[PDB]
């Protein structure tokens, strides 16, 4: 759908059987979700934002349903304030920026 940006572009995601709300974030290369039990292995990764870096866990091949659209990609789990759906998932659901 066409999302206007007057309010925060929050969407509902279904990941690992858990229902959560997440931000459609064009300034995020990677998607980082906090507080979800995700099974399997992980590699260390450190991602940077404004104010610095945080250490998260890189989980691969995780299925995500972002507003009823299916995608499989990389999900970082760790200390974020808000759940971020970054470009690595936004491309799969065919999300574009228009103006």
Ligand X SMILES: CC(C)[C@H](NC(=O)[C@H](Cc1ccccc1)C[C@H](O)[C@H](Cc1ccccc1)NC(=O)OC(C)(C)C)c1ncc[nH]1
d(CA 49, CA 99): 25
Q: Which residue number, 10 or 38, has a Cβ lying nearer to a second copy?
A: 10
Please tell me whether residue 3 binds a second copy under the rule CB under 8 A.
yes
Q: Which residue number, 17 or 81, has a Cβ lying nearer to ligand X?
A: 81
d(CA 13, CA 53): 25
Question: Which x/- pattern over 23-62 shows residues binding a second copy (rule: CB under 8 A)?
Answer: xxxxxxx--x--------------xxxxxxxx--------
């Amino acid at each position: 759908p066409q999302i206007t940006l007057w309010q925060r572009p929050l969407v509902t995601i279904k990941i690992g059987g858990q229902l959560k709300e997440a931000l459609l974030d064009t300034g995020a290369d990677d998607s980082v979700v906090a507080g979800i039990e995700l099974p399997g292995r992980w590699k260390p990764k450190m991602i940077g934002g404004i104010g610095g870096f945080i250490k998260v866990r890189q989980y691969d091949q995780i299925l995500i349903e972002i507003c009823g659209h299916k995608a499989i990609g990389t999900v970082l789990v760790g200390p974020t304030p808000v759940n971020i759906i970054g470009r690595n998932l936004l491309t799969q659901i065919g999300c574009t920026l228009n103006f």
